[PDB]
Amino acid sequence: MTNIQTQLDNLRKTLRQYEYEYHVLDNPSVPDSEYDRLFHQLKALELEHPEFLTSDSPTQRVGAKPLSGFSQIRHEIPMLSLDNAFSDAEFNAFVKRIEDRLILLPKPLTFCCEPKLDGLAVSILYVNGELTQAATRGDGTTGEDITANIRTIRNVPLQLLTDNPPARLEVRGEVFMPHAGFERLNKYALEHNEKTFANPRNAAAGSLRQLDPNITSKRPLVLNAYGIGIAEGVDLPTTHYARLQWLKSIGIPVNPEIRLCNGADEVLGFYRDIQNKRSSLGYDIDGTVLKINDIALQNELGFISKAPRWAIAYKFP
Amino acid sequence: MTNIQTQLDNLRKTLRQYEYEYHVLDNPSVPDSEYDRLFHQLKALELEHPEFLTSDSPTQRVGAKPLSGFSQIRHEIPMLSLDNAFSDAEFNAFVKRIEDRLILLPKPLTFCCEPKLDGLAVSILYVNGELTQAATRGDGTTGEDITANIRTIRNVPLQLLTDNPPARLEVRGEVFMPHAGFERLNKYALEHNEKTFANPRNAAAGSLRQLDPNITSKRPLVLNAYGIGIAEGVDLPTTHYARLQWLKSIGIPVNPEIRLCNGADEVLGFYRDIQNKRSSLGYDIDGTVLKINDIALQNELGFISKAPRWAIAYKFP
Ligand SMILES: Cc1ccc(Cn2cc(C(N)=O)ccc2=O)c(C)c1
Ligand SMILES: Cc1ccc(Cn2cc(C(N)=O)ccc2=O)c(C)c1
Ligand SMILES: Cc1ccc2cc(C(N)=O)cc(O)c2n1
Ligand SMILES: Cc1ccc2cc(C(N)=O)cc(O)c2n1
């Protein structure tokens, strides 16, 4: 035991807890000036005692050397994409088909509803609570290694807030750029004879394709997790909403507008509410993502790949 | 000009025309004994004058040397798979969703209906009317090279019956084994202390995985084309049924039970008719494949990959 090691462990625990409050809860217990006091005190002490430096310390988000290119990662579980609807009647048909296809339809058919973020889908692996790798969705089978870029994201924890993390946990989420950060970036880009971005999605896509993490760190990117891939050494909740509350509870950022609706009429009320809130959110959205809440009914319904919307195989009983 | 070359060109034209009559029309103009008289007369003359041997001659279906393994082929256009339904109401919802999603719905919504063959999906490329390559569907992006095995199939033409073939034409179809051939194969397999097959689909899958084409040729496999991939140097028909009639007209085998139905009620009549014919067809079927006939409405509806049946993105207008 040494005073320095004890000092470094205390600083790291305190900074991680403040980052959770500020980023995931949006309720910081201390001023930003206090968070920075502790942060650069930790950065100073680590440099004075390099033997006690850890790769997952709050001060190690930026890889000091750029990459040459991105490697290819084949996902163990395929990253899915969503099918779409453009009207209340088309949504009501998607529901009616599910009611007919399900063996047993529950009294209230519960849906977990959320705004559809206009971002980029990513997969982030935590091995024993430590961020080891991150990849883009790509084609759903193969993506690109973006580990160094994802580590730079301020609301992405380098380690999970839990004393008993899963052996392996893969978080799937959207990386986007809020309106305020996009406006700063363009003001800076135009007043430095640099490339301006048409919209925040192009700004987010361009930031994640940077080979130098030092640039990526100066791009105000944000993550909101929507789902889990690999999950080993854990009993995941049996409803989709409970899984998102569980990710939130172990340090993962999730969207605050997520609600549970019973049946198509309540789901349509959510779509209308989110449509009227569009101008006030502070980030871009394309619509609403509506899922069946019960995980057993999801497993029963399954997935499609790669099938036309103009053909169906009516199978014999 | 030589008499032998003229003799070989006449034999090849006559045999190809008889194969079309026997396999695609099911109306041979001559007895099987007559077809064989000309076939082994051609085989004899080619061996006596090896300089006039062609790789696409009716006598060159079997590669005399086995393969070591199968190479991988990435399809230029992705090979799709079908979504499914299990009831009249689930089928009626799939239709109702299309009616809501289409910008303009025509007076009769016409469907091209056919029995769902219990076979294996293959892609076959014809370059200037000559069979050059063939592959399995695989995952829809990558498949395996099965050229040597597909050439052995009696109803698969080695050259298209047309004086003006497309520059490149890719035929997509099902390879299956009819009941009569499956019964012979098992009688032979059991009376030779060899492996018997549980059903004709496993018999068909096992035949196409043979590295030696000499074995594959003794397996009574059959093709029925369901669609086109690549098509260069041709104006394809604007309805799906007309494309299948066009493939039939240039020497490609297609299923004889294909019909056009207007609306869901006529389509349900087709499903019931095919369900009652199941015991009489002479090959195995899983249900019926129902497609939108108009190719412009297909292009408008598009395809999905890889999306869950339990989620939908309701997009904003
Ligand atoms: C100088 C400085 C420090 C920190 C922040 C924002 N912030 C605040 C906290 C906090 N209050 O617990 C935690 C993490 C974090 O990133 C800004 C904008 C500027
Ligand atoms: C000996 C022999 C020859 C041919 C056939 C079958 N068949 C017949 C014709 C034909 N009639 O025009 C064309 C091709 C073909 O494969 C069998 C079963 C037996
Ligand atoms: C399964 C899946 C895939 C992509 C998604 C993307 C979003 C999104 N763009 O917000 C939300 C979801 O719930 C998603 N869910
Ligand atoms: C697009 C596509 C893909 C696979 C198919 C398979 C079959 C079949 N198994 O008969 C029929 C079709 O019309 C198909 N159509």
Short mmCIF file of C-alpha atoms in Angstrom, two decimals, chain A residues 67-288:
data_model
loop_
_atom_site.label_atom_id
_atom_site.label_comp_id
_atom_site.label_asym_id
_atom_site.label_seq_id
_atom_site.Cartn_x
_atom_site.Cartn_y
_atom_site.Cartn_z
CA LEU A 67 -4.05 5.23 -37.04
CA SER A 68 -2.98 4.27 -40.61
CA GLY A 69 -6.41 2.80 -41.52
CA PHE A 70 -9.34 0.82 -40.00
CA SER A 71 -9.35 -2.98 -39.61
CA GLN A 72 -12.45 -5.14 -40.34
CA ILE A 73 -14.47 -6.81 -37.52
CA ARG A 74 -17.02 -9.59 -38.18
CA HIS A 75 -19.78 -9.33 -35.52
CA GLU A 76 -20.42 -12.59 -33.54
CA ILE A 77 -24.15 -11.80 -33.46
CA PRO A 78 -25.55 -9.90 -36.51
CA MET A 79 -26.36 -6.16 -36.02
CA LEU A 80 -29.96 -5.68 -37.20
CA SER A 81 -31.51 -2.67 -38.98
CA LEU A 82 -35.19 -1.56 -38.91
CA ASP A 83 -38.11 -1.93 -41.35
CA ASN A 84 -40.31 1.21 -41.70
CA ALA A 85 -43.86 2.60 -41.95
CA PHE A 86 -45.14 6.03 -43.22
CA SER A 87 -48.78 6.18 -42.00
CA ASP A 88 -51.13 5.28 -39.09
CA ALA A 89 -52.83 2.64 -41.36
CA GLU A 90 -49.45 1.07 -42.41
CA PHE A 91 -48.46 0.96 -38.70
CA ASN A 92 -51.90 -0.59 -37.85
CA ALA A 93 -51.25 -3.33 -40.53
CA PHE A 94 -47.77 -4.14 -39.09
CA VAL A 95 -49.57 -4.62 -35.68
CA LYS A 96 -52.53 -6.62 -37.19
CA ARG A 97 -50.05 -9.03 -38.87
CA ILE A 98 -48.28 -9.59 -35.47
CA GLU A 99 -51.65 -10.27 -33.76
CA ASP A 100 -52.42 -12.94 -36.43
CA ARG A 101 -48.89 -14.48 -36.40
CA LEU A 102 -48.53 -14.77 -32.57
CA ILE A 103 -49.66 -18.11 -31.10
CA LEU A 104 -51.07 -16.36 -27.97
CA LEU A 105 -51.66 -12.56 -28.01
CA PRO A 106 -51.54 -10.96 -24.47
CA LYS A 107 -54.45 -8.78 -23.17
CA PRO A 108 -52.45 -5.51 -23.50
CA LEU A 109 -49.83 -5.79 -26.32
CA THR A 110 -47.08 -3.57 -24.75
CA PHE A 111 -44.60 -1.61 -26.91
CA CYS A 112 -41.38 0.19 -25.82
CA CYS A 113 -41.36 3.49 -27.79
CA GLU A 114 -38.54 5.97 -28.43
CA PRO A 115 -37.50 8.76 -30.81
CA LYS A 116 -35.57 7.54 -33.89
CA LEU A 117 -32.16 9.29 -33.59
CA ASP A 118 -30.56 10.39 -36.89
CA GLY A 119 -27.18 8.88 -36.00
CA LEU A 120 -24.84 5.98 -36.77
CA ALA A 121 -25.21 2.50 -35.28
CA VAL A 122 -22.20 1.20 -33.30
CA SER A 123 -21.37 -1.94 -31.23
CA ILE A 124 -19.17 -1.47 -28.01
CA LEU A 125 -17.67 -4.50 -26.18
CA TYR A 126 -16.97 -4.49 -22.39
CA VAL A 127 -14.81 -7.46 -21.17
CA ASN A 128 -15.12 -7.71 -17.32
CA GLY A 129 -16.38 -4.11 -17.31
CA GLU A 130 -13.51 -2.66 -19.44
CA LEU A 131 -14.05 -1.12 -22.92
CA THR A 132 -11.96 -3.37 -25.26
CA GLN A 133 -13.40 -2.88 -28.78
CA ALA A 134 -15.93 -0.90 -30.77
CA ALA A 135 -17.21 -1.29 -34.36
CA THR A 136 -19.57 0.30 -36.92
CA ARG A 137 -22.65 -1.66 -38.05
CA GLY A 138 -21.36 -1.89 -41.67
CA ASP A 139 -23.62 -4.41 -43.49
CA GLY A 140 -24.75 -6.05 -40.21
CA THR A 141 -22.20 -8.91 -40.66
CA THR A 142 -18.91 -6.90 -40.97
CA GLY A 143 -17.99 -3.42 -39.69
CA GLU A 144 -14.86 -1.32 -39.08
CA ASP A 145 -12.74 -1.09 -35.88
CA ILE A 146 -13.49 2.36 -34.32
CA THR A 147 -12.20 1.66 -30.74
CA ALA A 148 -9.82 4.66 -30.60
CA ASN A 149 -12.62 7.05 -31.78
CA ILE A 150 -15.35 5.68 -29.42
CA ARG A 151 -13.00 6.06 -26.37
CA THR A 152 -12.91 9.83 -27.04
CA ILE A 153 -16.71 10.14 -26.52
CA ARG A 154 -17.30 11.87 -23.14
CA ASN A 155 -20.52 10.02 -22.18
CA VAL A 156 -19.13 6.56 -23.11
CA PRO A 157 -17.72 5.01 -19.92
CA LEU A 158 -14.24 3.38 -20.26
CA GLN A 159 -15.36 1.08 -17.39
CA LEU A 160 -18.90 0.00 -16.29
CA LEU A 161 -20.27 1.47 -12.95
CA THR A 162 -20.62 -1.89 -11.19
CA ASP A 163 -18.65 -4.16 -8.83
CA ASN A 164 -20.04 -7.26 -10.64
CA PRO A 165 -19.90 -6.54 -14.40
CA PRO A 166 -20.82 -9.25 -16.96
CA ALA A 167 -17.94 -11.43 -18.27
CA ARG A 168 -18.74 -9.98 -21.73
CA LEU A 169 -21.32 -7.24 -22.57
CA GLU A 170 -21.84 -5.72 -26.05
CA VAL A 171 -23.77 -2.42 -26.09
CA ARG A 172 -25.48 -1.32 -29.37
CA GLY A 173 -26.27 2.39 -29.76
CA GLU A 174 -26.45 5.52 -31.89
CA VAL A 175 -23.54 8.00 -32.11
CA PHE A 176 -24.89 11.49 -32.91
CA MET A 177 -24.00 15.18 -32.62
CA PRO A 178 -26.44 17.48 -30.73
CA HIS A 179 -27.53 20.84 -32.27
CA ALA A 180 -25.41 22.95 -29.86
CA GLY A 181 -22.15 21.07 -30.65
CA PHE A 182 -22.86 21.03 -34.43
CA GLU A 183 -23.35 24.86 -34.36
CA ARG A 184 -20.00 25.41 -32.46
CA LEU A 185 -18.15 23.03 -34.85
CA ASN A 186 -19.38 24.92 -37.94
CA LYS A 187 -18.57 28.37 -36.37
CA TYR A 188 -15.00 27.04 -35.68
CA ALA A 189 -14.76 25.32 -39.14
CA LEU A 190 -15.89 28.44 -41.10
CA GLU A 191 -13.59 30.75 -39.01
CA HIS A 192 -10.57 28.41 -39.75
CA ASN A 193 -11.04 28.00 -43.61
CA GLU A 194 -12.12 24.34 -42.98
CA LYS A 195 -14.96 22.09 -44.28
CA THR A 196 -18.45 22.88 -42.84
CA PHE A 197 -21.09 20.08 -42.52
CA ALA A 198 -24.57 20.10 -44.10
CA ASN A 199 -26.27 18.47 -41.09
CA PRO A 200 -25.33 16.85 -37.71
CA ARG A 201 -25.49 13.24 -39.19
CA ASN A 202 -22.84 14.05 -41.81
CA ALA A 203 -20.81 15.78 -38.99
CA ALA A 204 -21.12 12.59 -36.84
CA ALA A 205 -20.21 10.24 -39.78
CA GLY A 206 -17.18 12.39 -40.67
CA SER A 207 -15.96 12.46 -37.02
CA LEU A 208 -16.07 8.65 -36.66
CA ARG A 209 -14.10 8.16 -39.96
CA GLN A 210 -11.13 10.23 -38.56
CA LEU A 211 -7.95 8.11 -38.26
CA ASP A 212 -6.47 10.64 -35.73
CA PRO A 213 -8.33 10.36 -32.30
CA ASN A 214 -7.02 13.84 -31.38
CA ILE A 215 -9.39 15.30 -34.00
CA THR A 216 -12.30 12.97 -33.01
CA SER A 217 -11.98 14.21 -29.35
CA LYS A 218 -12.65 17.84 -30.49
CA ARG A 219 -15.99 16.66 -32.14
CA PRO A 220 -18.92 16.88 -29.68
CA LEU A 221 -20.22 13.30 -30.18
CA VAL A 222 -22.76 11.56 -27.93
CA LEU A 223 -24.00 7.95 -27.46
CA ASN A 224 -27.50 6.67 -26.61
CA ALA A 225 -27.70 2.85 -26.27
CA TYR A 226 -30.73 1.07 -27.87
CA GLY A 227 -29.85 -2.65 -27.30
CA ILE A 228 -27.52 -5.50 -26.28
CA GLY A 229 -25.65 -8.03 -28.42
CA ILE A 230 -23.38 -10.51 -26.61
CA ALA A 231 -24.24 -10.87 -22.88
CA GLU A 232 -22.31 -13.54 -20.92
CA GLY A 233 -22.30 -13.95 -17.16
CA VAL A 234 -25.59 -12.05 -16.63
CA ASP A 235 -29.36 -12.65 -16.40
CA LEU A 236 -30.73 -9.91 -18.70
CA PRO A 237 -34.22 -8.51 -18.01
CA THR A 238 -37.13 -10.22 -19.88
CA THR A 239 -38.59 -6.93 -21.21
CA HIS A 240 -36.77 -4.51 -23.53
CA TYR A 241 -37.46 -1.44 -21.32
CA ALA A 242 -36.00 -3.17 -18.23
CA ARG A 243 -32.80 -3.96 -20.25
CA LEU A 244 -32.43 -0.20 -21.10
CA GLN A 245 -33.07 0.73 -17.41
CA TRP A 246 -30.40 -1.93 -16.47
CA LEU A 247 -27.83 -0.44 -18.97
CA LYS A 248 -28.61 3.06 -17.53
CA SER A 249 -28.07 1.70 -13.98
CA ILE A 250 -24.50 0.34 -14.80
CA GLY A 251 -23.22 3.65 -16.37
CA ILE A 252 -24.55 3.45 -19.99
CA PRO A 253 -26.31 6.51 -21.49
CA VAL A 254 -29.90 5.91 -22.78
CA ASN A 255 -32.46 8.32 -24.32
CA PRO A 256 -34.72 10.07 -21.70
CA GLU A 257 -37.84 10.11 -23.98
CA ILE A 258 -38.41 6.30 -23.89
CA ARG A 259 -41.98 5.24 -22.80
CA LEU A 260 -44.14 2.04 -22.58
CA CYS A 261 -47.45 2.11 -24.57
CA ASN A 262 -50.28 -0.51 -24.53
CA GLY A 263 -51.69 -1.18 -28.00
CA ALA A 264 -51.59 0.71 -31.32
CA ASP A 265 -53.76 3.69 -30.23
CA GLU A 266 -51.47 4.57 -27.25
CA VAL A 267 -48.41 4.03 -29.55
CA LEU A 268 -49.94 6.50 -32.09
CA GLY A 269 -50.35 9.02 -29.20
CA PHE A 270 -46.58 8.66 -28.52
CA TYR A 271 -45.74 9.23 -32.23
CA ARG A 272 -47.83 12.44 -32.27
CA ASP A 273 -46.29 13.68 -28.97
CA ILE A 274 -42.70 13.10 -30.25
CA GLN A 275 -43.62 14.72 -33.65
CA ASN A 276 -44.82 17.92 -31.79
CA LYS A 277 -41.60 17.87 -29.56
CA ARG A 278 -39.22 17.63 -32.68
CA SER A 279 -38.47 21.41 -32.67
CA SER A 280 -37.42 21.34 -28.93
CA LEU A 281 -35.23 18.17 -28.47
CA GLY A 282 -31.76 19.70 -29.10
CA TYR A 283 -30.74 16.85 -31.53
CA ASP A 284 -32.15 15.38 -34.85
CA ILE A 285 -34.76 12.58 -35.10
CA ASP A 286 -36.37 10.77 -38.15
CA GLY A 287 -39.50 9.32 -36.51
CA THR A 288 -40.20 6.87 -33.67
#
